[model samples]
Target: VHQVLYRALVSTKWLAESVRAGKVGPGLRVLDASWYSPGTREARKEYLERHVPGASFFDIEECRDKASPYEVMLPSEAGFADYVGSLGISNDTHVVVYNGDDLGSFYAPRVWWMFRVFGHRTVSVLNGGFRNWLKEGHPVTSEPSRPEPAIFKATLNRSLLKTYEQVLENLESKRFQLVDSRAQGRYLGTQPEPDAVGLDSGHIRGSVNMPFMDFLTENGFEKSPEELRAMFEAKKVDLTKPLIATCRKGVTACHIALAAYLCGKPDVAIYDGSWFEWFHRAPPETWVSQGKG
Candidate 1:
């Protein structure tokens, strides 16, 4: 029988083999979904300079709901359909997402989760991202591929997303375990926040700290499934229970969610607004500062 648990990750070797066999066309597509935080190198300009041979640049910021007050919030179903369709991704397409970031291939998992949130199941993240691909001697190209637009119908899976209200409810009900993906310093109120507007360095009350980088090696490769499971368990995160993953602005949270998926917990939901929205909405008393009683 086919394994009921599906992995949302693919290795560089697997992607290389597929590309060599000419399987990257038609029903299959590769996306260069590299993104960096503010003050980092430009993602798109770099993609134009060098990327996976047949990969198309997937701009995470551009594909989002621009009208929303929050940055990079999920776009409307129609908007999402149009953006992805423009990338030549139909509902049936198998999408392989990779990033050029050295920080554990963080962004590709966000795109992989986005596809799953839009009801597309055949999406996977390149295990070590572009950095690993290059290390493995894979071919790169500056040439771009123009794919004919296909009809990509998006059906937003509301269950996979958690709203600010839902998180508040969970705070009281203690229904879901909140998993904070920020670094220890940020989560514990020891470090200053990147976004200073109405935000602090502490995390939501009753949340467990699990930095997204914990799942990755120094060279940006994700740990094995066994190691991931042990890591989460050590943090007292129960994969069987309802869980919500959050980070500074909802980007790195996808890393934790991706880890949960690799550990066979597919029901975890993401707080899209994440700590940014939470800090804006909740009172200071609700936050748990470092070393607090």
Candidate 2:
């Protein structure tokens, strides 16, 4: 059996061995949980072309709070239960999630966080994701699997999630170090917010801006714990203290959790609504932009 000290991240070799040994089906499930801008990259089309053998595509768009005006907010408790249940994931089944990102990570962390928020800990993110999976020459298939559906019971862990109001009050409370995981340009208000026009803005009042992708190396694999710890230390983000990560829509923020998890600090929370909700709801004075945009 594949056992490791840090179950949050699984290597390509481990997954390959598990796949070669016929571990994927009921006991284990693999997910191609790529969520990206269709305008930039078509996730489903790529999955239809090729993916890990026996892997199923998990649509973040479909498995979201459709009623919310903002992008892919967390799905309701029953919504997640029914959705993952349809995907053959049960409480006992260990789920490994990966995304086809050039950077080796992307939306995979979002699904990883999703599984945890829904009360499942057996889930893990594939390190380096499909990029390293291909770089290392693992088997891929165009054919999808027909999984026998398994019922999943979901319990939303509210402690790991932060709302807009919670974040606003935190400006005064200073309970957690709020980190923004968007690009530096966006964080500095040098670039426009994704998709939406005229929304070029900076981070929340007291939050620190550390782009999520910085946690990865040049090849997209996560940086070593020493390097990650150093990065946190460089930003003055104390790993021992409470932390909350936020991004444009909460997708990349989970990378903070994964990064902290690798560093032996668990429960790095996510502001599910994140900046999207913050920008629309929070007052203009709170927006901290270094450069006028």
Candidate 3:
């Protein structure tokens, strides 16, 4: 059996065992990084009322770096480090992050990727997420959680992020592969991507559309490494080439990156600005697409 890289996942058993020992550890922090689209305000409000103990909530949108317009874009390294430190995290902390949802349909991987890009490697996503925790009859609390502050330091690894200028330059060079993780409808112009700007709600020219669902099983779990390899190969993705992954708001696209990593293609980077930032920032004339339906 192959050892998992970064110990990127923590099973419910590990969490339960940790809790039982009363040794949650000063260097371990759990974060509930659940987020919703703009229309789901009420659902988000309800989620906070019923969060796990010692679990701090992070709103992807509100906590992002303000320099970029993309909703929930990755924050600046220093800014993100400060936020984590304020949450009582330190560099050595083994952060276990999970969405409040069982399926982990969103947010968790995004936060994990953010941490990695910012040089925090000891982080992991809770396998099966919060839903699994509740289903297992683990403790749940309506009471709020607060922790003693600790130091969290982060160093920005610039190579993990892609800029609009780099994208344009790369598009002309065709030196790098671009994988767009939006849906086929959005890619083919049958539907408008949420919050897409002046350009029609289609994909960037010369990019491949690889919907995130393609990387998951029917039951919503991620596919095995070999299966993922075959899936990307089937999509004509050059696994050997460095890949830049993107989606509507850069959330699900990180799933693509994680899948790539799992498939042994570590030369992967995420376009944090994604379509949200791209549409808003691209010049009208520079926009190219299949046109909105």
Candidate 4:
């Protein structure tokens, strides 16, 4: 049986076969969700130059949550619905999202998870992303194709997502594993503060530091499938267990969930408030650390 959380994912072969068989449905909507850091504005420029056939660009910062005090947080249901609707996406559309970067490199799963949290399970992240798809000699087009708008109905499901109250409760209950994707220094209270949230700089109590970089290579690319599986195994994280991933903000934590999903863990949920939101409101005295250097 196919994995439920990953049911939306289509293999390269599956996509290729479907295209070849002329089974490419009209309701299919492919999204090019390529995002770069504030300093790197090349993603949009690249998208304008070339993208997948009939693909539309989905800017994470533009369409995702904007009201949250923290960056990269998921937006409200109504806000998300309006954004998706403007993209001409309907509930019936089989949404396939891909990033120009390597899988799990940026916030690919964040959008995937956002759609899921918003009650759209038909959304999927392109396995291996554009990098692999191009490496395999799949067809790519430099000219952009405009699609006629489709109706997208949004029905938000709050349960699959976490809130500040639930996160605080989880912090005290030890009922969930808190996986922080920040670097060891930050998690250990050693690195110079990057973004000041006016709270303690350390990490959540009893949380494990899984720096998202651990799942990547020296070249800033995702590790091979075997290497990724082995890395998770080395961390002693059980693939069957549910997890709550957090980072300085919610952005990189999605990478943690992406890696977890790749490692066969589907119950991973991200703490959207993350350190930014957590620290912004945390008492000054609550921050403490006891980790290694």
Task: Report the number of the highest-TM-score candidate.
Answer: 2
lDDT score of model 1?
0.83
Q: Could you tell me how far off, in angstroms, the CA of residue 277 lies in candidate 1 after the best superposition?
A: 0.5
The 10 consecutive residues of candidate 2 with the worst lDDT sum are 1-10
RMSD of each: 2.3, 2.7, 3.1, 3.8
Steric clash pairs (candidate 4): 90-151, 90-152
Question: 142-247, model 1: which lDDT tens digit per residue?
Answer: 9978988888999998778999989998889998989988888988889878757645778888878898888889878888889999998898878988888888
Better of 1 and 4 by TM-score: 1
Q: Could you estimate the TM-score for every candidate?
A: 0.94, 0.95, 0.89, 0.81
Model 2: pairs clashing at backbone N, Cα or C within 3 Å: none
Which scores higher on lDDT, 1 or 4?
Answer: 1
Candidate-wise lDDT, in order: 0.83, 0.84, 0.73, 0.68
Which of 1 and 3 is the better model by lDDT? Answer: 1
- For model 2, residues 1-293, the per-residue Cα lDDT tens digits are 11243487888888789988998878988889986774898889999798998899998889998999788888889999898989888989999988888888878888898888887878888877898888888899999678999899999987788888878888889888989888788887787776786665678877787898798888878888889888889989998887888888888888988888888866677889878888888787887787772
Clashing pairs in 3: none
In angstroms, give how far residue 211 of model 3 lies from its true place: 1.3
Sorted on TM-score, best first, the list reads: 2, 1, 3, 4
Instruction: Give the best candidate by lDDT.
Output: 2
Write candidate 4's Cα lDDT for 251-276 as tens digits: 66777666766666656777777777
Cα shift from native, residue 158, model 4 (Å): 2.7
